Design a binder for this molecule. Structure first.
Ligand SMILES: *[C@@H]1O[C@H](CO)[C@@H](O[C@@H]2O[C@H](CO)[C@@H](O[C@@H]3O[C@H](CO[C@H]4O[C@H](CO)[C@@H](O)[C@H](O[C@H]5O[C@H](CO)[C@@H](O)[C@H](O)[C@@H]5O[C@H]5O[C@H](CO)[C@@H](O)[C@H](O)[C@@H]5O)[C@@H]4O)[C@@H](O)[C@H](O[C@H]4O[C@H](CO)[C@@H](O)[C@H](O)[C@@H]4O[C@H]4O[C@H](CO)[C@@H](O)[C@H](O)[C@@H]4O)[C@@H]3O)[C@H](O)[C@H]2NC(C)=O)[C@H](O)[C@H]1NC(C)=O
Ligand SMILES: NS(=O)(=O)c1ccc(C(=O)N2C[C@H]3CN(C(=O)c4cc(OCC5CCOCC5)nc(C5CC5)c4)C[C@@H]3C2)c(F)c1
Ligand SMILES: [Ca+2]
Ligand SMILES: [Ca+2]
Ligand SMILES: [K+]
Ligand code: NA
Length: 805
């Protein structure tokens, strides 16, 4: 209920909201339907427009006017933004050449530079270049400040999940806003764009910037704007708040614009009608910058210009209909559009089976414009599984397309020419970042980065300690002139054993049948030192990975590779090796095919065996260091050690073999050597975090051998590719993947063809950051380089995406 009986006089745009049923005067009262009767009259003045003219210069203050051109206006902080331009002969901020801001140049009383976050819905990254001619203020922010060529949103590339990611530093699966539309089965409640429910606090997890600020004693402007408050009035309010005296004036502010997204949906990303919304956004930026300049704050405030996602061409006729696939279409609920989420219409239906729905949706038409997944099988880089609001069945929709349940949903709701929501590596979904102010660098370009990193940098800009989040704090240190955050490497928890020769061959009963009987003084001091670490400098280039949890493990040295062997999981946690540009590929010789040899450094108790694989009709095995790449046929025997073996489904073996036999050598030719680190991942509860031993759901039949959910590789080389990977003097280059370990290749529709037609495409889909592999393994890489730690943190967050420029 609301008793709107009181008055808004003196309270216009209130920083501390009051409680029901007393009437409100804050920037959100409208959207709650609760403002005092006189709110519009007093707080939403429109008289005489948004600009001073010659004649208004030194008018007598008339309290009805939208803004003022009277002598007193500056100390009152309510001049029109162009006052000093029209009435005092000053220039527009955009016409001033840029000059480096080396220190904050603030009025007395400011304890820190304020932060203004100017967010623009649907602002696609390519607008910075394609609209440059019609956005002079933005262009100046961009070229004078620090900017990225683009910024990667989170999946799904929808509005609420991204604004809330920007607020919190969390993936949607952690902050809870997993879509623009949601059902929470624990609450039995629905969240919708339209309507009241979205205001309930139980939807919104983590801790957003404004709470972080409040809890550490920094005052926050109110971030949220009711749709009907015109842009010019939002800018005026922020300028007025910045005039407030020392202990009242907020230190952080947000402006939000509904454009260019509103027009993007109607006309497409580059519709001719899109020039005007771009012009209007730049004009608003101009008003803010002229306003700050009048207040002498244009060299004091840090400004961030930032989008939530881009925009793609999408039309009614590019819709796939599940009614063309499923005979049971009235038994399901679908969240439709640029993604698909499916659940049972009724949980009392015992006929609803996910498995057969997925099967009926798999590679059914030859150019199908979506692909079905169980949520745990989605690319791990999307981090989109661990929340009860995300349905088990997901559809990833091709760019430019929609999915819907039935034709009648699409004509009884062509309307739209643009939409967004697709896979967050898609080029049309990329968005913008510019930072301008004393704390940002001057005229600097930084490489593209993910929006999950910004909350940490906004906390750095404000002197706040961030709540725990998914950013990697210090990876964006290169954007900042000062206030950088200096982290330390996490401490190693478990120290490795270094076992010698401790077991005889006859202590093992592996049931393999290896041929290995072939027998020298010169070669045996040399194969000895290879077991003690002489080529380790070649194969372990950046130090051994640190293990950050409590476990029992062994370092194993060989001529061609080094590994960290887990006695608990009965396989390597990691296997490291370097393949030079000159390396030769040999084939597997038949005397050795099903040969697997005991490793005399490791007990039969802590080893795998061949018998379990022979009994398991589904499961076969492969090797982490590839026998195809061994340096000499004496070294090739190390490749067949029981301690280099891992469980693999025959369907996965086709992917792994092609990677190891064809792709590795290719990457070495192209990159001038590569160093490869490979291993298993166990994520049975799809939380993105290393499993403990008691979370493993599947073992090789009749053994203690755990089955990985995924296999990773991290492939590193010199950024300057004229130096070889093993003698690199400067910055590094990296690409990685996390391949799902699946019993079939149903994910790849073309898998009956040769591997050179589909394997590499699958790898590209499952590209990964080093940091994703770290969360999934509890390991820390690149411990020993000659680079700064901040540069290494940037390297670890890098994602190789496989889109053109
Ligand atoms: C991305 O960054 C984030 C942020 O750091 C990372 O997520 C964190 O992961 C931590 C480790 O898994 C986790 O720590 C746990 O905290 C539990 C306490 O939970 C509450 O308190 C915190 C603190 O303020 C709060 O953040 C939580 O908020 C969640 O819950 C509600 C939803 O119900 C939402 O409002 C909110 O959005 C958020 O949801 C998200 O996280 C939860 C998991 O907590 C998911 O279920 C949701 O889907 C969603 O993703 C909470 O309100 C605590 O219970 C945990 O302790 C258990 O496990 C330990 C192991 O140490 C064991 O010792 C304990 O005894 C306990 O186990 C007992 O309970 C079990 C189950 O109830 C039971 O089976 C056992 O028998 C045991 O008796 C744990 O310490 C932290 O909560 C989240 N934080 C956030 C914000 O999500 C994330 O990992 C990063 N992602 C990647 C890929 O790196
Ligand atoms: N996707 S679509 O279907 O086309 C689509 C769908 C719906 C709308 C819509 O009605 N609006 C009206 C807008 C008002 N608004 C905010 O005021 C706002 C700003 C903000 O800002 C968070 C800051 C955090 C720091 O980084 C910058 C933003 N955070 C939040 C939320 C996370 C807590 C809200 C965003 C609302 C979406 C739309 F417009 C497009
Ligand atoms: Ca949006
Ligand atoms: Ca896990
Ligand atoms: K088998
Ligand atoms: Na297939």
């Amino acid at each position: 209920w609301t008793a709107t009986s009181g008055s808004c006089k003196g309270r216009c745009f209130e920083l501390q909201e009051v409680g029901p049923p007393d009437c409100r005067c804050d920037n959100l009262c409208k959207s709650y339907s609760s403002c005092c009767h006189d709110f519009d009259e007093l707080c939403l003045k429109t008289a005489r427009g948004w600009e001073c003219t010659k004649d208004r210069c030194g008018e007598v203050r008339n309290e009805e006017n939208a803004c003022h051109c009277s002598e007193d206006c500056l100390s009152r902080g309510d001049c029109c933004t162009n006052y000093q331009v029209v009435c005092k002969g000053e220039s527009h901020w955009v016409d001033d050449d840029c000059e480096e801001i080396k220190v904050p140049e603030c009025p007395a009383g400011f304890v820190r530079p304020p932060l203004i976050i100017f967010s623009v819905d649907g602002f696609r990254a390519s607008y910075m270049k394609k609209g440059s001619k019609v956005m002079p203020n933005i262009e100046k922010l961009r070229s004078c400040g620090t900017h990225a060529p683009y910024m990667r949103p989170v999946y799904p590339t929808k509005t609420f999940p991204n604004l809330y990611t920007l607020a919190t530093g969390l993936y949607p699966e952690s902050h809870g806003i997993v879509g623009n539309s949601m059902y929470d089965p624990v609450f039995d409640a629905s969240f919708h764009l339209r309507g009241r429910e979205k205001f309930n606090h139980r939807w919104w997890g983590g801790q957003p910037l404004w709470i972080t600020a409040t809890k550490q004693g920094v005052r926050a402007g109110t971030f949220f704007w009711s749709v009907s408050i015109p842009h010019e009035r939002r800018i005026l309010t922020i300028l007025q708040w910045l005039s407030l005296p020392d202990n009242e004036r907020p230190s952080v502010y947000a402006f939000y614009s509904e454009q260019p997204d509103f027009s993007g949906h109607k006309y497409g990303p580059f519709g001719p009608e899109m020039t005007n919304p771009l012009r209007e956004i730049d004009k608003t930026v101009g008003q803010l910058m002229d306003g700050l300049k009048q207040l002498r704050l244009h060299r004091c405030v840090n400004v961030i210009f930032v989008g939530d996602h881009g925009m793609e061409d999408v039309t009614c006729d590019r819709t796939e209909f599940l009614s063309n696939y499923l005979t049971n279409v009235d038994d399901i609920t679908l969240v439709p559009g640029t993604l698909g989420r499916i659940r049972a219409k009724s949980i009392n239906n015992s006929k609803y089976d996910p498995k057969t729905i997925i099967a009926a949706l798999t590679c059914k038409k030859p150019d199908q414009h979506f692909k079905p997944y169980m949520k745990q099988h989605l690319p791990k880089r999307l981090h989109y599984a661990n929340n009860r609001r995300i349905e088990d069945i997901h559809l990833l929709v091709d760019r430019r397309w929609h999915v819907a349940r039935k034709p009648l949903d699409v004509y009884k709701k062509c309307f739209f020419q643009g939409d967004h929501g697709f896979d967050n590596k898609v080029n049309s979904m990329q968005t913008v970042f510019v930072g301008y102010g004393p704390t940002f660098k001057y005229r600097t370009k930084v490489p593209p980065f993910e929006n999950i990193e910004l909350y940490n940098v906004m906390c750095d800009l404000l002197g706040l300690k961030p709540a725990p989040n998914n950013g990697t704090h210090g990876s964006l240190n290169h954007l900042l002139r000062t206030n950088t955050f200096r982290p330390t490497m996490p401490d190693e928890v478990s120290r490795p054993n270094y076992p010698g020769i401790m077991y005889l061959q006859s202590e093992f009963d592996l049931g393999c049948t290896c041929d290995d009987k072939v027998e020298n003084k010169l070669e045996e001091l040399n194969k000895r030192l290879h077991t003690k670490g002489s080529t380790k400098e070649r194969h372990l280039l950046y130090g051994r990975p640190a293990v950050l949890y409590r476990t029992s493990y062994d370092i194993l040295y060989h001529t061609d590779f080094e590994s960290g062997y887990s006695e608990i999981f009965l396989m390597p946690l990691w296997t490291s090796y370097t393949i030079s540009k000159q390396a030769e590929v040999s084939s597997i010789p038949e005397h050795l095919t099903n040969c697997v040899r005991p490793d005399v450094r490791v007990s039969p108790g802590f080893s795998q065996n061949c018998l379990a694989y022979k009994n398991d009709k589904q499961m076969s095995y492969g090797f982490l260091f590839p026998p195809y790449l061994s340096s000499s046929p004496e070294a090739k025997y190390d490749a067949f050690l029981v301690t280099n073996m891992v469980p693999m489904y025959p369907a996965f073996k086709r992917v792994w073999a092609y990677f190891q036999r064809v792709l590795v050598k290719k990457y070495a030719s192209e990159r001038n050597g590569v160093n490869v680190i490979s291993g298993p991942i166990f994520d049975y509860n799809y939380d993105g975090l290393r499993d403990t031993e008691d979370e493993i759901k599947q073992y090789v039949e009749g053994s203690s051998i755990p089955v990985p959910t995924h296999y990773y590789s991290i492939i590193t080389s010199c950024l300057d590719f004229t130096q070889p990977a093993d003698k690199c003097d400067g910055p590094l280059s990296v690409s990685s993947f996390i391949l799902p370990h699946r019993p079939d290749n149903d994910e790849s529709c073309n898998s009956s063809e040769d591997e050179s037609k589909w394997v590499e495409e699958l790898m590209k889909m499952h590209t990964a950051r080093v940091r994703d592999i770290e969360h999934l393994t509890g390991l820390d890489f690149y411990r020993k380089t000659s680079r700064s730690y901040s540069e290494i943190l940037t390297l670890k967050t890098y994602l190789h995406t496989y889109e053109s420029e």
